[PDB]
Paper text:
Using biochemical and structural studies, we identified four more residues in α3 and α3-βI loop regions (PHD2/Ile280, Arg281, Ile292 and Gly294 that are substituted in PHD3/Val102, Leu103, Val114 and Glu116, respectively) and which play roles in determining selectivity. Indeed, we found that FG2216 (IOX3)35, used in clinical trials for treatment of anaemia, preferentially displaces NODD over CODD from PHD2.
Residue numbers in the entry: 188 to 243, 246 to 404, 409 to 413
The structure:
Amino acid sequence: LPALKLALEYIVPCMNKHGICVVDDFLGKETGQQIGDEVRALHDTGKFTDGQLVSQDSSKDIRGDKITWIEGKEPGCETIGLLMSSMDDLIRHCNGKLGSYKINERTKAMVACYPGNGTGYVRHVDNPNGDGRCVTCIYYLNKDWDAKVSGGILRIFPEGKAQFADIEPKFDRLLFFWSDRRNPHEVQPAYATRYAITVWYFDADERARAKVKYLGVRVE
Ligand SMILES: O=C(O)CNC(=O)c1nc(Cl)c2ccccc2c1O
Ligand SMILES: [Mn+2]
């Protein structure tokens, strides 16, 4: 599907209505599997961190999600860069229709690997203090994921709503949601290796004034 039809007929109305939007089969099996291959290659060659220290004898320490930051131009990351370009194309075609936000900037990609040792990620808000991030975009890479046996569901707790939104981390699934306090969320314990790629998109105004908050030119 062209970035434009998805954006205009699904992503814009869904984000303005629900603030949580899922696109399945975003890039297709061939491209999705190549991205999976690149991510697994990064993992197998030690490009990830050792993992979030979950509990602290140091040999018995439990570590959780591993991460690596990817620009998309690195050797062996070109298909990740293609994913990032595709995300950018969608956001570009949503211009002026997501909230009243103006998006002209993003982060690098954060590739995350939950190692499958029963660790997850605690309930949190991505941007609770106004750092400029307005949309969280996550792409999942896990073929034939069965949450009934592997866990790893993303559970979102939409504000003002007495309800859960449970999202399985399915292969070739793209997810968008508002990054601020509207969408507290958690990753339930994962019992199999679980990969995802996240990009955050900035609202230009919030980012500009965030620079005032968290602050140079020489004076002679
Ligand atoms: O992977 C998922 O479905 C959802 N993950 C997250 O919400 C998530 N959020 C943050 Cl802020 C971090 C932050 C650092 C490392 C991993 C994260 C993560 O997986
Ligand atoms: Mn998060």
